Design a protein around this ligand. Sequence first.
Ligand SMILES: O=C(NCCc1nc(Cc2ccccc2)n[nH]1)c1cc(-c2ccc(F)cc2)cc(O)c1O
Ligand SMILES: [Cl-]
Ligand SMILES: [Cl-]
Ligand SMILES: [Mg+2]
Length: 214
Amino acid sequence: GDTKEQRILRYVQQNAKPGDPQSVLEAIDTYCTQKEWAMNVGDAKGQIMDAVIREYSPSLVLELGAYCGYSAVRMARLLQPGARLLTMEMNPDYAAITQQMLNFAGLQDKVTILNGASQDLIPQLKKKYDVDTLDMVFLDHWKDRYLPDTLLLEKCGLLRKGTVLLADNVIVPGTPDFLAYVRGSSSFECTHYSSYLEYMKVVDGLEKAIYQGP
Ligand SMILES: O=C(NCCc1nc(Cc2ccccc2)n[nH]1)c1cc(-c2ccc(F)cc2)cc(O)c1O
Ligand SMILES: [Cl-]
Ligand SMILES: [Cl-]
Ligand SMILES: [Mg+2]
């Protein structure tokens, strides 16, 4: 008390413009470069995310892991009018920071926070949250959950031909089982985007895995 996440939110509120997502991203990146490192996707990998979002213009995006809402703000600002982001966050303190971050950025109408474990929420998406299929999934939660949640998404019928999975941290901390699985599966077309760990001179990367159907 206070936490790093509360300090990041306060910094944004006092160093960005309300309703200006770009200024929010810049404020978070400045804080995390100059004051305290935090596990936001960051600008380096964020620019790759931007390129992917702009290519596919997804109407419905699922994010696994919100943290402080950096990637939610990053993706939501590039969504077309009426397009929507659902973000799953198990940590209630993170969920509170993310909501306030979205509110400040003026993106609250485009993004909905789902509270709970992804393994509990994913099976509820169709009946409770009126989802048919997902256009894109951003994986950025517990690294050992990338593979089981991907398999659960398929089981629940939430993936379609062309659904884009984009996974953060496939190098550091790394997601070896997920990476081996999607790269070895005929149901995925994979591309690796080499980059750097947020705010650090350390190699990381994103994996894009496009679902091909069964
Ligand atoms: O752990 C990370 N992220 C998960 C954060 C998170 N966990 C939740 C709980 C939740 C659970 C289930 C479902 C939805 C949410 N929400 N958000 C993460 C770590 C690092 C990193 C750390 C130390 C280091 F030395 C190097 C790198 C870098 C990263 O980019 C990351 O994303
Ligand atoms: Cl993030
Ligand atoms: Cl960065
Ligand atoms: Mg990450």
